[PDB]
Design a protein around this ligand. Sequence first.
Ligand code: HEM
Ligand code: HEM
Ligand code: HEM
Lengths: 306, 306, 306
Amino acid sequence: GTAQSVILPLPSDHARFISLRLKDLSVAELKKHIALLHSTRDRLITQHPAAQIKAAVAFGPEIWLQLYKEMPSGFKQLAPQQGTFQMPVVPADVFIHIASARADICFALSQAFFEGIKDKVEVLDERVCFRYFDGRDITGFIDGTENPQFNDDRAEVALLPEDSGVFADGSFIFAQRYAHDLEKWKRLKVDTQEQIMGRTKLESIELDNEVKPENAHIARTVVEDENGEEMEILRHSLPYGDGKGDQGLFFIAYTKDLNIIDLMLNRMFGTSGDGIHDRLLHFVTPLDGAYYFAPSAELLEVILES
Amino acid sequence: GTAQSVILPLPSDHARFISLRLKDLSVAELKKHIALLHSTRDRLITQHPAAQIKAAVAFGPEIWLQLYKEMPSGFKQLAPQQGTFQMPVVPADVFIHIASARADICFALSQAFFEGIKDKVEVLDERVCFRYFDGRDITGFIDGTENPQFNDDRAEVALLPEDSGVFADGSFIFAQRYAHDLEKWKRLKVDTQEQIMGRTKLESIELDNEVKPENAHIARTVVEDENGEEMEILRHSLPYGDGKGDQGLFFIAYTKDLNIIDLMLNRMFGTSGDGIHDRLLHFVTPLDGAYYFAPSAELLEVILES
Amino acid sequence: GTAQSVILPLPSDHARFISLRLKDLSVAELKKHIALLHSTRDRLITQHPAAQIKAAVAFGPEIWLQLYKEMPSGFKQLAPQQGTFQMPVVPADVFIHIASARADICFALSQAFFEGIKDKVEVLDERVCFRYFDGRDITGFIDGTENPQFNDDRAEVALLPEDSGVFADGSFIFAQRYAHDLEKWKRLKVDTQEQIMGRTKLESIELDNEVKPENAHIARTVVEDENGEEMEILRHSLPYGDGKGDQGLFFIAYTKDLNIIDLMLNRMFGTSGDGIHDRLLHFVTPLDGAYYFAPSAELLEVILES
Ligand code: HEM
Ligand code: HEM
Ligand code: HEM
């Protein structure tokens, strides 16, 4: 098997994305506080069964081996990008994806995990996110058009397969917060923004092959395998922002093969070898970034009980 | 496998039903514009996952062989009724069933199909339909009481089985628009209208065998095989009308065996051999009628890619 | 297989719980009126598919063998308690659990069953029940926290397994109305109420083992098999009351093994052998109580058609 509960369902209106380092927290204390998160999750589900209360807990490469003495195949840390643009890496031990139809429930789950250990861990970010109008990024463009939509497709794209042993129905998480320069963006003509993205702004209709430039965002993030077959990821990104400061997109993807995300990042930032970079990177900036492993619910339970 | 998306779910509040002949449109152009419909369908699903965006595309027996080289078993055109009342047959090459919780989305899918080809095809009808109060026909009687209701029952009744090969999860459509003579109908006592339909008006309680006439509508549309077991169809009929002109029911059924609909129509129009016809035909009039085959979503995709 | 429709879904906002003895009603008449209940249920489902229209019909052990040739293994009548507190048994021939999102639908189903037989049966109770604020008992404590929640868990706990043959997907019902003494309850400090229940009042957080007393309600109702595994039941209890008179909880549980309920009641009322009783029983009084068997929907259909 069973994916953790946030991965497969369609996105809810509210989320919290948490990345942290253990600092003074022990592995046993971490298990206790994941169990505390689960306890409050379970309790509120019984009280609010329509509130779409969902979560995933995932782990960095180093702490994972402290929980389970075997790596999933291909698990590794994200590598920085030194291309036309720079992409940073900020390693984190624990990632928590909380989501619900309600902002107060998203907070309740975070509160439950952190109760009594606020000063024992080092939280890199606890990002509050929200659906933004009709599923748009704050550029005004719809985000998610080519994301897998059917349940079975979402599972096939995101989840490790049955012959991964205990790692089956786990998933690799790539999480990276972007901050937008909307003032620079808003000076562009709409036609130009559509050239940068590769889809139309109002409708998200894909631009024709003649009209879409090679450096458009979705030209760079569409990737094929050796046989020329398209390779996909399951995105769960959500906007965030404050009027006073950063505003942008919290990018997150679930995948059964981090090599797919490596390739897209190479092509966006300009390290793929073909001399091209994503023109959208002239208007948005990544501020963190890491890779994690989200076990299945059954494997997570084994870890908590060990 | 997969039935086309409109067949199995319970009916939505809004629909459009389209019958057309290719006229000047080429088979290649037809595949292009189905794909355009599918493209707008898919895009709007992503943006409105709760809007119940559904459709089926189906083909007449004459054009099907130009799209696929094998004929599903039992596929033939609707035959005329030389009965007490006459039933017209108006062949069409393409039938399109569009449904949604929202009227604007129904329009958007039709607009997507027709963009740039309005004068190349011969549209027989594009009927806007709506759920009418608590699922009633404009006679005031509830329509659907004995329709299969469970998902499994609906699939069993409407869909070709696994042994049909490529044709599995396809379905045959019978579509026929009716105009009602409400002036005549409303001159009846309610007790008489209940005699004519075979259920009570307010509640749709079935009349007892002692009270139900042999020429009541549901006495004629209940049919059984050689072993006395009832044969069923999956109706998706919906009211339509304008105050200024025609008002009625757009009748449509999905079935895995067109012979069942042949038998019901024979009993209705008075050619089954017992000399009885449906008294309801004194108050409603068929204005067209045809049979079609709706492939599975997989087979349709193969047709589109071919 | 198919459990009767009310068992597995999460609870709706309104219910009616009916217990009766046949008195002058014949077995044939009983089947007729169960069929009338089913007919009205089916008809209303078609008109209100979102109104959560559900029911279970179940039978006492005394009448079951008049309806079917074989007893499900272990079926028996409730036994009385003579412990710290007394528990009479009030046997009944037929139990009906009616539920819906709407009170009028609940009445409609009861009306349909009873039409024309009100003076033929001996109705012991027809209790109108309602969800009380956020799923609470009128004590103010949330009721349901440790109930099975996932559909598959609820099925495993409540339903007879496949090796029960024709009884597979049947369920045993224990139904028992309680009246509360709220004036006595409300004189307690909340911390004492939490001692009595074993969970916190506002949040239903379980009390730590060191603070939960041995005679707390959930200390008595948490029961363990010989191999150390906790034995569960599926509760569907709902509050009832009138300002002028009795107010309380209509307790009802579905289980695959009545021996589980036996042990729970023994521990609560003080006859289990450890000399302890449930302190909650100082504030609530049982007013009836009996065991029933709810067949699968298919087995129920066999009984109706025989
Ligand atoms: C602030 C940063 C970003 C913004 C505003 C953004 C926005 C968008 C938009 C508007 C689309 C088209 C609609 C859609 O199909 O979802 C899209 C597509 C996509 N983006 Fe991004 N994106 C960002 C960063 C990223 C990153 C870091 C990746 C990781 C490699 C990524 C991967 C993808 C993918 C895989 C698609 C689907 C393309 C396809 O298959 O057609 N995006 N994005
Ligand atoms: C103006 C045209 C029609 C009207 C107003 C109409 C109306 C109704 C009504 C009020 C019912 C009873 C409620 C229900 O069980 O759905 C019904 C049932 C039914 N109708 Fe029609 N109908 C029309 C045409 C047709 C046609 C052309 C067919 C088939 C060729 C058909 C097939 C059926 C069937 C199979 C049932 C279910 C009967 C049963 O199994 O009990 N109807 N219709
Ligand atoms: C007026 C009478 C009763 C009241 C007010 C009451 C109230 C409660 C409350 C507040 C809880 C804790 C929340 C929960 O887990 O659902 C609970 C749990 C429970 N009750 Fe009762 N109850 C009553 C009678 C009974 C009876 C008669 C039985 C069985 C013979 C029973 C069996 C259980 C069980 C099995 C649990 C779950 C315990 C666990 O596994 O943690 N209850 N009840």
